[PDB]
Amino acid sequence: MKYILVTGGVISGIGKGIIASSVGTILKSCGLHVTSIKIDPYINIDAGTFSPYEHGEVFVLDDGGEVDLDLGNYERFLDIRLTKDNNLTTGKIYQYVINKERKGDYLGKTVQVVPHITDAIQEWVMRQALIPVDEDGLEPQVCVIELGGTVGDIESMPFIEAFRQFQFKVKRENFCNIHVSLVPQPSSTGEQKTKPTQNSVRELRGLGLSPDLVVCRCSNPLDTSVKEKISMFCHVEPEQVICVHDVSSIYRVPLLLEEQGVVDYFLRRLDLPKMLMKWKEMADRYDRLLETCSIALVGKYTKFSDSYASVIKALEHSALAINHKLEIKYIDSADLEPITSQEEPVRYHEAWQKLCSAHGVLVPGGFGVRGTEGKIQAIAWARNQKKPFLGVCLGMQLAVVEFSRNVLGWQDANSTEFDPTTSHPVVVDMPEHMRLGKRRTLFQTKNSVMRKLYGDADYLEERHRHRFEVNPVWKKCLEEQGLKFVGQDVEGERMEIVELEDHPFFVGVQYHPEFLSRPIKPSPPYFGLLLASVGRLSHYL
Amino acid sequence: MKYILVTGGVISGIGKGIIASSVGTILKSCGLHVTSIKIDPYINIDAGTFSPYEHGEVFVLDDGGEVDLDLGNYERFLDIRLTKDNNLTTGKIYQYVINKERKGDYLGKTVQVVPHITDAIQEWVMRQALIPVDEDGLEPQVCVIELGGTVGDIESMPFIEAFRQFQFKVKRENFCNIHVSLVPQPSSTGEQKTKPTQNSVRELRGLGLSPDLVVCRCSNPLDTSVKEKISMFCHVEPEQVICVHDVSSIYRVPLLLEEQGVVDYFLRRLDLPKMLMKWKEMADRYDRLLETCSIALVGKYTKFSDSYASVIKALEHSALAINHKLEIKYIDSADLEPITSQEEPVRYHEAWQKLCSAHGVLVPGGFGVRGTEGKIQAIAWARNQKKPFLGVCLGMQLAVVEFSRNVLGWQDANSTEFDPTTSHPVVVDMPEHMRLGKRRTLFQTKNSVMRKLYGDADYLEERHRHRFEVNPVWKKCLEEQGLKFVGQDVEGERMEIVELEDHPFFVGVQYHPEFLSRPIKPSPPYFGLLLASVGRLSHYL
Amino acid sequence: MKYILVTGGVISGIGKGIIASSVGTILKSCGLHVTSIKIDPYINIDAGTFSPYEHGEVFVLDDGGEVDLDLGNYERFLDIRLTKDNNLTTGKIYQYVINKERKGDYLGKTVQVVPHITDAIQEWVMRQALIPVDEDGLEPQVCVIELGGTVGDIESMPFIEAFRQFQFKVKRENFCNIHVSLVPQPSSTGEQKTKPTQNSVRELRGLGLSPDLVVCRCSNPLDTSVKEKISMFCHVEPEQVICVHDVSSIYRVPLLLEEQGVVDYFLRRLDLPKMLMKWKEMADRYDRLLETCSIALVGKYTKFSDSYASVIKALEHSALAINHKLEIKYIDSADLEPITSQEEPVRYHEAWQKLCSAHGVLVPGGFGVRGTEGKIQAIAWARNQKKPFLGVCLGMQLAVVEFSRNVLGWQDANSTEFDPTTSHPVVVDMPEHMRLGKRRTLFQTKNSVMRKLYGDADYLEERHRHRFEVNPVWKKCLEEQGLKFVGQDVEGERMEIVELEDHPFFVGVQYHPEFLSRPIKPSPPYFGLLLASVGRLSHYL
Ligand SMILES: Nc1ccn([C@@H]2O[C@H](COP(=O)(O)OP(=O)(O)OP(=O)(O)O)[C@@H](O)[C@H]2O)c(=O)n1
Ligand SMILES: Nc1ccn([C@@H]2O[C@H](COP(=O)(O)OP(=O)(O)OP(=O)(O)O)[C@@H](O)[C@H]2O)c(=O)n1
Ligand SMILES: Nc1ccn([C@@H]2O[C@H](COP(=O)(O)OP(=O)(O)OP(=O)(O)O)[C@@H](O)[C@H]2O)c(=O)n1
Ligand SMILES: Nc1ccn([C@@H]2O[C@H](COP(=O)(O)OP(=O)(O)OP(=O)(O)O)[C@@H](O)[C@H]2O)c(=O)n1
Ligand SMILES: Nc1ccn([C@@H]2O[C@H](COP(=O)(O)OP(=O)(O)OP(=O)(O)O)[C@@H](O)[C@H]2O)c(=O)n1
Ligand SMILES: Nc1ccn([C@@H]2O[C@H](COP(=O)(O)OP(=O)(O)OP(=O)(O)O)[C@@H](O)[C@H]2O)c(=O)n1
Ligand SMILES: [Mg+2]
Ligand SMILES: [Mg+2]
Ligand SMILES: [Mg+2]
Ligand SMILES: [Mg+2]
Ligand SMILES: [Mg+2]
Ligand SMILES: [Mg+2]
C-alpha cells in the first residue's frame, strides 16, 4: 500500500477534514481504491459516551460502532463503508497496549512509549489500511491518514514519533506527508504573512517529518512572492505550495486541488497507477439555483448546529436533486410546547409561525423527556393540516403516540421512556440481546409510498441506534385505522417503518436514513419529504 | 503540603534515585515527616508482569503491591512504609482516565490529554501525598516526587505539563524543582563542559519549569569557573549549583548535600519548620573495615546483579553490624547441578570450590525448574558439612525436599511445582483465595534460635510472595526427626519458618526478610546467617 | 566543486579539527585536489590582535595573513598553501557587508541578516573554494568546511542558515554534511549513552540540515546496540554511524576513518572521481621508538602549551625522521634569569639543571622585555659549553646581543626593543614600508652548515614576522670574529641567517621555520638541531 499523512500547522480550524476528504476524492477519481483513517488524540474509546448537546452528533457504522463526525465526512466524499477502528483515538492505543501488558503478551519486559505504544500505532495503521472498505470487496491501494491536533501539541507526540519511524519501515516511494498551515493577512497592512508557517515547518522538520506538500489556508489567494518565500524556508518547490482560499461550497475544494496539479503530484511522488466532472456540475448547480423550499426541523439540540450534521447534509443532498435552494427552519420543541404560554407567549407564537410557514416538517431523534410534548403538537399539526411529514428514530415512536393519543382517543398515551405509569403504554424498552449498526428490514405490503421511494425491492439494509419499540398488543388495534406498519424485523418481532394512508405524505422510520445519504444520491426518506413538500411526488411516481 | 520535583537532564543514569533518596534523608534528618512518589513513564500497571532475568527483582509492599526497585530504595533511605500507588506508572494514569471515560464519569465531553490526563496526574499526586506513610500514623509535611526519563523525551510530556500547571494551583512557597545534569570532562582536554546542561535548562525552562537548584553529576568536583558559568545561563546563583562527584559509597551522598547547604536552602525556599551523625559514622565504618567474611549466593538469576538487589543490600546491612567486609560468592545453581559433568567438569568443579570455600550459604527465591537439583545439592552439602545455611521463599521448600529426599530416604521426593507425578509429593500449590504482601506469623515453640534472633516476641509480621506450601500429611512424619516447623500461619494452616536442631545454624523462611532490612538495622535471618558464619552467634546469645 | 560541512554536536572539544583534517587527508590520498575553510564565529578580523599568552600562537600564511592555529593544522595534514580568507571569522563577514552598505553597493534597500549576511557567507565560501591552494596551481575538486562553535549556539546561526540555503543552490550531489557528537559513558553504570546525540540531531535537523554521516567521540569503541539506536533516531544507516575512540597519536585518526569506510562513502555520496601507507608506517614508528633525546625550549610563554604549537610540532616531525623519542624540557627564561637568586635559588638552580641536562637548546620568538636576560644566559651557556643551539626570530637577535656583550666585550650591548639608551646599540627597529609573510633570502657564503641542510640551493623562500634587525654599522666588526652572517635580504639590506664557525652547531634565523614543517618532512633548522644533538650531523653530511 501507499500512505498519505495530513498534519496540522499553526492552529486547529484550518480545515484538515475537507483537505483529507478532497485528497481522498481526487484519488478516488483516478480509479484508485482509496481508504482513510482519522487519528484524533482524545482519551474517549468511542463516540457512545459523547453528549450530543456538547460534541455534536454521534455517527453510526455498519458494525454498530459509534464514531466521530469526520468518518461520516469520509463516507460522504469517498463513497465507502468504514470500520469502527479506522477511527484511532489515543485511548484505544493505550487500552490495547495495557491489555497486552496485563496478559503478559510482552514477556516480562518494561513496556515503553517509543518502543511499544509508538509501535502499536504503526501496526494498527498497517492492519486497518488493508481491510476491504470498498463495496467491490477489494484491498485498497492508498490510505489517507488524517492526524488531529497540531504539531508541537503534547497529545500529537506519540503519533508524530510513530510516523517518523513509519516512513522508513515502508519505503519512501510508499509514504508521503501533506502539511496544512494558516497564512494570516492582518487588516493593519493587508500583506500576507509566512512567518508562522516557517516556524511550523521548522517544528515538524525537527520532529523528523518533512512536508512533501504545503497547503496554505488564507482568505484571498496566495501571490507569487509568498509561494517563493514558503518554497525557500520549507524546502519544497514553488509548485508544491498549494493555496486553499475561501469558496462558496465544500464541493469546490477537490476542484482547487485538481487545477493546482495535486493529483499530478501524487501520481509521481508515490508512483501510483471523470467523477470530478459530476462534482463540478453539482458545484455549479448549488451556486445557480434560486427557486426555494423550506423545511421545519423540530429538535431539542437546535441550540447548536453539528448536533444534526448528517440530517442537514441529507436534506441538502436531497435539495440539489430536487433543484431547490433549501432553507432549514430550526425549531426548539421546548419552545413549541404549550408550557411556553406561561412564561412568554411571543416565543410560543413565533415557534408556531416558523412551523406553519414551512413547506414540510421533520422530527429527528434524541433520548430523554425535554420538549417531547412539543413534538406531539408538531405531529398533531402535521396530521391535521396535512403538510408533509417525516419522523426518524423517535419521530416514528412519537407518531404512534400522537395517533394513539388523538385518533384512538387515549388521553394518557405515552412511551415508557417518558412515563412508565400510564394506561395504554404504546412503546416499551425491548433489548436485542441496544439495537445498533446495520440490520435487515422487510416490507409487509405492496401499497406503501416508502416502498416505491426505495425502488420497490422487498427488503432494506439500514443503520439503527435505539432500544424502544411499539407494543405488539396495541399494534393489533392501531392497524384497524389509517396507520400502516409498512416494514418490520426479519420475522416480524419489531416495527421498522410506519405510514399513514389518509395523508399526502406522513411516515416514520426506526433507523437513521441520513448516514447512507451521499452528494450524488440522497437516501429515499428525505428525498420523499422534499418531493412531497414541492408537491412533485405524484408526478415522480 | 510542600512538594519537591526531581527532573533529569542530559541522559538517564546520572543518579536521580540516589539524589531523591538523599533529599528525603536530609529532610527526614530535620524531624520532618517526608513521603515520596516515583513517577516512571512505562506502560506496565505494576511490577508483577516483569521477568526477573531482564528487569531485576520485584519489590513487595505491605499491600501486596508488586512494585519497581526504586520504592525499596526509598523505604531503605527514608525508613517508611510505602503504598502501591506511590509508584505512578503512565499506564495507571491512562487506565484510570479510560475507566472514568467508559463509566461516563466525564459527562459526554471529549476527554483530552491537557485538560484531563494532565489533571488526573495532579489529583493522584495530591491524593497519594496525604496518606500516613510514617509508622507514627501522621500526615506528611513534604513530598519528594522523582520523575523518570529525561526532559524532552515524549514519555515525560504529560508529567512535565502536569507539573507546569501544578506550581500555580499549589502556591510557589509550596512547590520546588531540582534539576540533575551531566557535566562531561572529555579526556581529549580535561576541561569540564557546561554546554549540554545549558541546553537542558533552556528545554526545561521552555516547557515552563525553572530549576530552583541545579545538581551536576561529574567524576571530579566542579571548579569555581563552571559554577559561575552555570549560574549565568541557568538563572540560579553560584550557591545553587550543587556538585555530586564520585564517592566510595552511597551513604556519603546525603553528606555531600548537607555540607553544600541543600538543607539550608529548602528550609528557606519552602519555609519549612541528628540522624546524619549515625549516617556519617556508618559511612566511615564501611571505608575502614578490613576483616572479611564470604557468603555463597546460590541463584539462577546470577547472570545479572539487580535480580537480587534487596538480598545483597540485606547482607551488606548485616555485614556492617557484624563489622566485617563482605564478599558475595555468586554461584549459578545450573553450574552446580551434576549435569555440568557431561559438558565441562571444570565449570562444575569451580562452582563446588566457590561453595566449599565460603563461610556460609544462602538460597534465594525464584519460580521454575531451571537449576533446582543444584540447590538440593547445595543444601545437602550445607547439612552434611554443617556450614551455616539460610533459605528464603523456595529455600525453605527445597530444604524440606532435601531432608525428605536424603533423611527420610524418599528417592523421588520433589515439589509439585517441578514434577506433579512423584510418590511422596512433599510441597503443593495452596492458594490463599497467591499469598502476597504483609501477613502475621506465630511461633509454635520456645526452643528456636530464629525466635531469639527476632527478639523473643511470640509473633512476626512479614512480607510474602508465593503459592506453594508443605503438605500437612507428610508434615506429621518430618517432625519425628531433627527438622522443626518453628513458625506458622494464624491457626496453623501453612508452614512459615523451619529450623534443624542438629546443626549450628540451618533455617528456612517462607517470606522475604530482605524488604524489611534497613541501613541502621538488618532483618534477623540475614544477621543470624552472618553471626553463625563468623561463629559469634553463641556469644551474641 | 563538491563541499563537505563538519558541524559540532553536544559540546566543543569533541575534536572537529582532527576529524576535518582527517577527512582532508583520506580525500588527498585518493589523488583529489582538496581545499579547506575554517569558519570560527568570534568577532576578531584576524589573529594579529591575539595575546600569545592567552589564545596560543599566531600562525603566518604566505600572504602575511596572521591566522588561527587550525589553518596550520590544515597545512600540516593536507600539504597545501592556504590564503588569509580561508579563515572566515564572523567579524569579517559583518565588516564586508557593512562596507558594501556604507558604499551604497546595496541600492538604498534595508540590508538584513537572512537575505544579505547569510548570502555574503555563501558567496565567500564559493569564492575562496575555487582558488589554487595546491602547489600544482590547479583549481580544487572538494572543499572541507569546518564550522566552529556547536549547533544551537547563537553565534552559529548565520552560518547554519547559510548552509541550509547552500545545499539547494549547489545541487545535493555537490553538498554533504558530517555531524560530530559526544557519546558519554558515565562510571556510575558503564553503559554508553545516545540521548544527547539524539537531541543534537533533532536540533540540527530542525535548523534544516540532515547529517549524511554521524561521528561519535567516546573513550571506548561503540557497540552494535548503540550504532543501531543512533541509526533509528538520526535517519542514517548503522553503517553511517562512525566511531572515533581514543588512540595513541593523531596519525591514527585518518586510519580509523579509512577502515570504517568513510572514503568508500564520499566517493558515492558526492560521485567524486597510497599516501595512507606512509601515514601508517609513520604512526607505527611513533609507537615503537624507545631511544630518547631531550631539547631545552627556553621561552616566556611556557606557562601554556599551544603558545608554541608549531615549534613543538616541528621538533616532533624532526624527531621521527631522527628515529628518537623526543622530550621537550620546557624552561621559563624568567626563572633562568639571575634575579631569581634574590627570591628562591632552588627555582633558579632547577632551571639551570633542566638546561645543563638537555642534549641541545632552542630559543623561540615573542616580543617584550620579560626574561630577555635569561635568554642571554642560555645562549652564553650554549656558546661556552658547546652544546648545539638554534634561535628563531628573537633567537637570532639575542645571539648577536650575547656575542657582542661577551665576545666584543660591550657590557651594555642590547637591542633598542629592550633599551634604546645604551652605547653600542646592536639591533634597531627597521620597518619594510612590519616584515610579514613569505619573502626571499639569499646565501652569501658556500661554507655554511645551514646551506647544506637546506639542500645547497642558492636561495630560500620563508615566512617572516618581525620589525627589528642587526645594525649595518656594527655588522662590519662582528664578522671580523667567528660569527658569520650566512644569509640576507635580496640586495643585502637585512640579515636573515647567522652561524658561528667555532662551534659544533650554533645558528640564528630571522624567519619562522616551523610553519613549513610537515609530518613527512621536517624543515631544515629543526632537523639540523636534532642531528647535531644526537651527534649524527657529521655522518649525515
Ligand atoms: N467533507 C467535509 C468536511 C468537513 N465538513 C464540515 O466542515 C466543518 C469542519 O471542517 P473541518 O475540515 O473538519 O475543519 P475543522 O473541524 O474546523 O478543523 P479540523 O481541521 O481540525 O478538522 C464541520 O461542520 C464538518 O462536518 C463537511 O461538511 N464535509
Ligand atoms: N501544550 C498543549 C496544549 C494543548 N494540547 C491539546 O490541544 C488539544 C485541543 O487543540 P486546540 O483546540 O487546537 O488547542 P486550543 O488550546 O484549544 O487552541 P485554540 O485556542 O486555538 O483553540 C487538546 O486536546 C489538548 O490535549 C496539547 O496536547 N498540548
Ligand atoms: N538509595 C539508593 C539509590 C540507588 N541505589 C542503587 O543504585 C543503582 C542505580 O542508581 P539510581 O540513582 O537509581 O540511578 P540510575 O538507576 O542509574 O538512573 P536513574 O536516575 O534513572 O534512576 C541501582 O542498583 C539502585 O538500586 C541504591 O542502592 N540506593
Ligand atoms: N547561548 C550561547 C552560549 C554561548 N555561545 C557561544 O559559545 C562560544 C564558546 O563555545 P563553548 O566553549 O563550547 O561554550 P561554553 O559556554 O564555553 O561551553 P563549555 O562550558 O562547554 O566550554 C562563545 O564564542 C559564545 O559566543 C553562543 O553563541 N550562544
Ligand atoms: N590535525 C591536527 C588537529 C588538531 N591538533 C591539535 O589538537 C588540539 C585540539 O584538537 P581539535 O581537533 O582542534 O579539537 P579542539 O580544539 O579541542 O576542539 P574543536 O573541535 O572545537 O576544534 C590542538 O592542540 C591542536 O593543535 C593537531 O595537532 N593536529
Ligand atoms: N524521543 C524519545 C526517545 C525515547 N523516549 C523514551 O526513552 C525511554 C528510555 O530512556 P533512555 O534510556 O534514557 O533513552 P535511551 O534511548 O535508551 O537513551 P540512552 O541511549 O542514553 O540509554 C523510553 O522509555 C522511551 O519511551 C521518548 O519518550 N522519546
Ligand atoms: Mg475535522
Ligand atoms: Mg515580511
Ligand atoms: Mg533509579
Ligand atoms: Mg568553553
Ligand atoms: Mg580546532
Ligand atoms: Mg537507555
Residue numbers in the entry:
A (entry chain C), B (entry chain A), C (entry chain B): 1 to 273, 280 to 439, 448 to 555
Please share excerpts from the published article on this structure.
CTP synthase (CTPS) is a key enzyme in de novo CTP synthesis, playing a critical role in nucleotide metabolism and cellular proliferation. Human CTPS1 (hCTPS1), one of the two CTPS isoforms, is essential for immune responses and is highly expressed in proliferating cells, making it a promising therapeutic target for immune-related diseases and cancer. hCTPS1 functions as a homotetramer, with each monomer comprising a glutamine amidotransferase (GAT) domain and an amidoligase (AL) domain. In the presence of GTP, the GAT domain hydrolyzes glutamine (Gln) to produce ammonia, which is transferred to the AL domain to catalyze the conversion of uridine triphosphate (UTP) to cytidine triphosphate (CTP) via an ATP-dependent intermediate, 4-phospho-UTP (4-Pi-UTP).
To stabilize the GAT domain, we included 6-diazo-5-oxo-L-norleucine (DON), a glutamine analog that irreversibly inhibits CTPS activity by covalently binding to the glutamine site. Using 312,573 particles for reconstruction, we achieved a final resolution of 3.3 Å. The structure showed that hCTPS1 filaments consist of helical arrays of tetramers, with each helical unit rising by 105 Å and twisting by approximately 40°. The tetramers are connected through α-helix-mediated interactions involving residues 346–357 in the GAT domain. Notably, residues H355 and W358, which are critical for filament assembly across species, exhibited continuous electron density in the density map, underscoring their conserved role. In our structure, two CTP molecules were observed bound to each protomer: one at the interface of three protomers (overlapping with the UTP binding site) and the other within a single protomer (overlapping with the ATP binding site). We designated these as the canonical and non-canonical binding pockets, respectively. In the canonical binding pocket, the triphosphate group of CTP is stabilized by electrostatic and hydrogen-bonding interactions with each protomer. In the non-canonical binding pocket, the triphosphate group interacts electrostatically with a loop, while the cytosine group is stabilized by interactions with S21, K319, and F77.
